[PDB]
Amino acid sequence: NAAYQLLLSKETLNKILQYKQNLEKGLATPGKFFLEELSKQEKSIDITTFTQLLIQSKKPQVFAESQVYHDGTDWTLEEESILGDVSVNMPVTMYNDGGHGSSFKNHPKPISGYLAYVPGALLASGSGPTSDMKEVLDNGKLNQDKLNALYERRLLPQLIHFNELARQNEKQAAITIPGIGTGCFSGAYYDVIKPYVRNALIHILEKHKDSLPYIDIIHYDPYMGDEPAEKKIGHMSFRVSPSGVVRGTTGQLDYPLGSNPDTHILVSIVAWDHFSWPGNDYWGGARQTDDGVKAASTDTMGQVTGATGVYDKKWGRYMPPESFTKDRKGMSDWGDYVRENGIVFNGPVLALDKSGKLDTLE
Amino acid sequence: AAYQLLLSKETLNKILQYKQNLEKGLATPGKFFLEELSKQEKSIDITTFTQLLIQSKKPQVFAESQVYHDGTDWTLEEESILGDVSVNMPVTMYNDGGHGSSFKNHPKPISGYLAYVPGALLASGSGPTSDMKEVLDNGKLNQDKLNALYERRLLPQLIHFNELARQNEKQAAITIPGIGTGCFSGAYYDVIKPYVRNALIHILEKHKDSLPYIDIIHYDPYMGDEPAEKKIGHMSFRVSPSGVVRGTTGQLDYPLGSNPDTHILVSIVAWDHFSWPGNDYWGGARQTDDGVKAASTDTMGQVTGATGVYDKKWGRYMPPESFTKDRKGMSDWGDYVRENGIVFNGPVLALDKSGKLDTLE
Ligand SMILES: [Br-]
């Protein structure tokens, strides 16, 4: 029904069915936003609709690192532990290379590619401990293996999806990855989490090397905090190319070295968050963070809302349609558009079993 | 120039000690400092030494990740000095200073003042910073040391705007944000908000008798503190988080009980050690307190001397159209200062045991 597609792992589906059963029995009260979205339909009892409504509770723009209290006021810890494992992919038209600020370079002809919003580990909050913190932290220390398992759970669905898609397109997949969960979703671990994320990526690609034959190039760019390097994981080329260390490196929304549109599909991973739509900050009109810049530099808003925006080259952002912004004062963001048109974030949802992708448990 | 820089007395002690170690001793300058030095013809004057050290700052710097605290950029002494340098300017505030699309354009732009003060730097991609070495004792954040740091960095601007309100036969209304609290805190984001609140209250209660013409101070950390109102001597200290209390005036607007007729409006900006006033907006991004407050005012016009044009649909002070004409893509003021060779240099003053000038010792 929509243009995007949500994916989740198998342990995530186990948690989902456990939470649904505990809600059906009575020993679990939902969160405010989840119950809010529920109190708009007429059912309870179906699993994919439960998950779709839980995902619909997400708001267009949320500061996941300070604006959430992790209780009934917004989202419970079970709801958040589920939402943090939900990724969403979509076909996009990349208008520039994805550079931040004024560093973006407009593509002469816009590139056709794919985005995969994956929410990173949330290790910061203005209130109490988060679920991810309770998961990958052992007495303050950051557990490498637990973080690897978390990122595997959150990334393998999109990896296998784009593997199969590259197989269907008779091409290979070149995936550009940023410093996911490293900007400010790390809080007190910003100074140690980049090598942990690099090792998590390398471990995921080494553990499932034989299951991703059509993935060819992985272009990891944490801007800084890591040495530029090249590693050969089975048949794949994992390139750590920090843009602040290696000048002239290909942007996130551009084909890395050794890939081109004829022999490669261009897919880019986006640092998402637990409680926001794809684009987060740009839903408030700010072209910030990996999420916001990658959404503004593509037609993400057009794909989620269904509207037909127009890309502005002097500003490097996908602008809302002129029919909306016509008689408004000041700046009008896409959040105003979703509020005026009653647009909700809801789309098809799939899960990974012990092989392929489906939607039921068994 | 249009701006004016201020520093405390301990800052002048550190400056003269570093200068003496440079005149003849075991102390090498930094790359950017020596670079700015290697363009003039002097060596051994105090205000020019400090002016060139301040000129070492670049238009847009990520002070929280891009500095190694050594010879590659700035040494720790240079950083301990630069973090204590504030700069005040007369500005024309065009909107209320809201982030994103939440800004509301003033019908008539307000005439006011900005005071860029660098907050406590408690995060770096390399080793410990000077501020960290100053206000941290075995990981713990010392409240009194942070109070002393913010005193050194704020009291000069406080007395400056006190005297300015006295000269204009008005009073001073100071809007203060969550300085050094957003992400320049690293592992202290969850504890630094009440510490900054306590630092402000301690500074204003300790030196209340020295600031008779400042009346209303409107502190807004957006979120993370309860809304409150306190009467410190004759002053009104209002904690009004904009994310909890809807309808708040804002950082670039007169708080309740003040207007241009009876109050001068000055706003404090969370600056950094190594950047020009405006930092992120020098890269074309209207982000952070620094960048948003610079884009919503004529800060770039006052620092570069050029005559920009304010865009209402975007809430930003744009480079001149004659400049911005035949360009590809977006165009920041950093390109303007790079193409026109504009440098950040202005008058510098210090505080003795009373007022501010520069007789040193
Ligand atoms: Br922006």
mmCIF file of C-alpha atoms in Angstrom, chain B residues 220-356:
data_model
loop_
_atom_site.group_PDB
_atom_site.id
_atom_site.type_symbol
_atom_site.label_atom_id
_atom_site.label_comp_id
_atom_site.label_asym_id
_atom_site.label_seq_id
_atom_site.Cartn_x
_atom_site.Cartn_y
_atom_site.Cartn_z
ATOM 1 C CA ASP B 220 16.201 28.442 29.146
ATOM 2 C CA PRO B 221 17.805 24.971 29.038
ATOM 3 C CA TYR B 222 14.920 23.791 26.818
ATOM 4 C CA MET B 223 14.477 20.567 28.806
ATOM 5 C CA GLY B 224 15.872 18.930 31.939
ATOM 6 C CA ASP B 225 15.020 21.410 34.691
ATOM 7 C CA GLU B 226 11.835 22.436 36.453
ATOM 8 C CA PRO B 227 10.395 25.855 35.518
ATOM 9 C CA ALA B 228 10.995 28.256 38.389
ATOM 10 C CA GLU B 229 11.402 31.901 39.372
ATOM 11 C CA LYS B 230 13.868 33.128 41.997
ATOM 12 C CA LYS B 231 14.627 36.594 43.370
ATOM 13 C CA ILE B 232 18.393 37.036 43.773
ATOM 14 C CA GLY B 233 18.713 40.369 45.554
ATOM 15 C CA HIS B 234 17.136 42.778 43.068
ATOM 16 C CA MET B 235 17.243 40.421 40.069
ATOM 17 C CA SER B 236 14.697 38.050 38.497
ATOM 18 C CA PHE B 237 16.217 34.638 37.704
ATOM 19 C CA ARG B 238 13.675 32.743 35.578
ATOM 20 C CA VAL B 239 14.235 29.104 34.604
ATOM 21 C CA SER B 240 11.813 28.716 31.676
ATOM 22 C CA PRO B 241 12.473 25.544 29.653
ATOM 23 C CA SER B 242 10.911 26.097 26.234
ATOM 24 C CA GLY B 243 10.213 22.381 25.831
ATOM 25 C CA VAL B 244 7.976 22.188 28.912
ATOM 26 C CA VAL B 245 6.389 25.661 28.977
ATOM 27 C CA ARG B 246 4.724 26.597 25.691
ATOM 28 C CA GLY B 247 4.555 30.256 24.730
ATOM 29 C CA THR B 248 7.915 31.253 26.218
ATOM 30 C CA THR B 249 9.372 34.452 24.758
ATOM 31 C CA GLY B 250 12.695 32.978 23.641
ATOM 32 C CA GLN B 251 16.396 33.722 23.643
ATOM 33 C CA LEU B 252 16.185 36.534 21.055
ATOM 34 C CA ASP B 253 13.174 38.327 22.552
ATOM 35 C CA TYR B 254 12.307 40.475 25.542
ATOM 36 C CA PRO B 255 11.238 38.293 28.501
ATOM 37 C CA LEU B 256 8.191 39.177 30.594
ATOM 38 C CA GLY B 257 8.430 42.551 32.304
ATOM 39 C CA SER B 258 10.950 44.015 29.846
ATOM 40 C CA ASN B 259 10.656 46.074 26.668
ATOM 41 C CA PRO B 260 13.030 48.201 24.547
ATOM 42 C CA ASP B 261 11.978 51.386 26.368
ATOM 43 C CA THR B 262 13.066 50.262 29.855
ATOM 44 C CA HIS B 263 15.419 47.357 29.063
ATOM 45 C CA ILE B 264 18.323 46.617 26.751
ATOM 46 C CA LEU B 265 18.093 43.068 25.395
ATOM 47 C CA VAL B 266 21.337 41.069 25.458
ATOM 48 C CA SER B 267 21.581 37.328 24.850
ATOM 49 C CA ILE B 268 24.399 34.962 25.806
ATOM 50 C CA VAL B 269 25.587 32.446 23.207
ATOM 51 C CA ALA B 270 27.205 29.071 23.913
ATOM 52 C CA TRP B 271 30.509 29.590 22.096
ATOM 53 C CA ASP B 272 33.565 27.334 21.808
ATOM 54 C CA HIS B 273 37.322 27.605 22.193
ATOM 55 C CA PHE B 274 38.525 27.467 18.590
ATOM 56 C CA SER B 275 35.841 28.985 16.342
ATOM 57 C CA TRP B 276 34.645 32.410 15.309
ATOM 58 C CA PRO B 277 31.318 33.619 16.737
ATOM 59 C CA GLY B 278 28.725 31.642 14.778
ATOM 60 C CA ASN B 279 30.784 28.433 14.338
ATOM 61 C CA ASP B 280 28.380 26.062 12.602
ATOM 62 C CA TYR B 281 26.665 28.769 10.550
ATOM 63 C CA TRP B 282 30.067 29.615 9.077
ATOM 64 C CA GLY B 283 29.562 26.240 7.384
ATOM 65 C CA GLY B 284 26.055 27.219 6.281
ATOM 66 C CA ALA B 285 24.143 25.229 8.922
ATOM 67 C CA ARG B 286 21.680 27.032 11.209
ATOM 68 C CA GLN B 287 22.417 24.589 14.001
ATOM 69 C CA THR B 288 23.191 24.717 17.732
ATOM 70 C CA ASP B 289 22.805 27.790 19.938
ATOM 71 C CA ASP B 290 25.879 29.334 18.289
ATOM 72 C CA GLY B 291 24.797 28.858 14.681
ATOM 73 C CA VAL B 292 21.112 29.606 15.239
ATOM 74 C CA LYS B 293 21.809 32.797 17.190
ATOM 75 C CA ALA B 294 24.351 33.964 14.612
ATOM 76 C CA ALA B 295 22.087 33.226 11.639
ATOM 77 C CA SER B 296 19.103 34.946 13.290
ATOM 78 C CA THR B 297 21.168 38.130 13.808
ATOM 79 C CA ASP B 298 23.586 40.205 11.735
ATOM 80 C CA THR B 299 26.563 38.560 13.450
ATOM 81 C CA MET B 300 28.212 37.795 10.107
ATOM 82 C CA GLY B 301 27.584 41.358 8.982
ATOM 83 C CA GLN B 302 29.348 42.705 12.066
ATOM 84 C CA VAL B 303 32.273 40.260 11.939
ATOM 85 C CA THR B 304 32.931 40.414 8.185
ATOM 86 C CA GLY B 305 31.873 44.039 7.704
ATOM 87 C CA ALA B 306 29.726 43.063 4.717
ATOM 88 C CA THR B 307 26.058 43.990 4.277
ATOM 89 C CA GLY B 308 24.061 40.777 4.052
ATOM 90 C CA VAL B 309 20.331 40.338 3.541
ATOM 91 C CA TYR B 310 17.983 38.502 5.898
ATOM 92 C CA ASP B 311 15.760 35.780 4.419
ATOM 93 C CA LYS B 312 12.382 35.466 6.143
ATOM 94 C CA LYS B 313 11.408 32.154 4.522
ATOM 95 C CA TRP B 314 14.625 30.646 5.928
ATOM 96 C CA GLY B 315 15.338 32.735 9.034
ATOM 97 C CA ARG B 316 18.997 33.339 8.177
ATOM 98 C CA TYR B 317 21.299 36.294 7.535
ATOM 99 C CA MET B 318 22.429 35.597 3.968
ATOM 100 C CA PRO B 319 25.636 36.678 2.227
ATOM 101 C CA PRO B 320 25.204 39.637 -0.143
ATOM 102 C CA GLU B 321 23.335 38.883 -3.350
ATOM 103 C CA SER B 322 26.195 40.419 -5.341
ATOM 104 C CA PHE B 323 28.303 37.730 -3.645
ATOM 105 C CA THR B 324 25.770 34.874 -3.617
ATOM 106 C CA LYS B 325 24.858 35.499 -7.283
ATOM 107 C CA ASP B 326 26.756 33.137 -9.612
ATOM 108 C CA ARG B 327 27.393 30.239 -7.276
ATOM 109 C CA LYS B 328 26.785 26.501 -7.464
ATOM 110 C CA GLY B 329 24.945 24.792 -4.638
ATOM 111 C CA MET B 330 24.848 26.301 -1.152
ATOM 112 C CA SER B 331 27.179 29.078 -0.015
ATOM 113 C CA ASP B 332 28.323 29.719 3.539
ATOM 114 C CA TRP B 333 29.884 32.820 5.059
ATOM 115 C CA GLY B 334 33.037 30.735 5.451
ATOM 116 C CA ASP B 335 33.470 30.916 1.690
ATOM 117 C CA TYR B 336 33.072 34.694 1.998
ATOM 118 C CA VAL B 337 35.796 35.035 4.632
ATOM 119 C CA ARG B 338 38.034 32.631 2.691
ATOM 120 C CA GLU B 339 37.589 34.473 -0.620
ATOM 121 C CA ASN B 340 37.887 37.978 0.879
ATOM 122 C CA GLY B 341 40.645 37.130 3.377
ATOM 123 C CA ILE B 342 38.599 38.345 6.347
ATOM 124 C CA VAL B 343 40.204 37.673 9.733
ATOM 125 C CA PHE B 344 38.765 37.550 13.254
ATOM 126 C CA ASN B 345 40.515 40.337 15.161
ATOM 127 C CA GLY B 346 39.209 43.054 17.451
ATOM 128 C CA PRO B 347 39.762 45.063 20.629
ATOM 129 C CA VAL B 348 40.435 43.066 23.797
ATOM 130 C CA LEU B 349 39.911 44.119 27.425
ATOM 131 C CA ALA B 350 40.458 42.567 30.856
ATOM 132 C CA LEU B 351 39.025 42.976 34.355
ATOM 133 C CA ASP B 352 41.044 44.208 37.331
ATOM 134 C CA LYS B 353 39.438 44.525 40.770
ATOM 135 C CA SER B 354 36.643 46.755 39.412
ATOM 136 C CA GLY B 355 36.077 47.745 35.774
ATOM 137 C CA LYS B 356 37.471 46.634 32.428
#
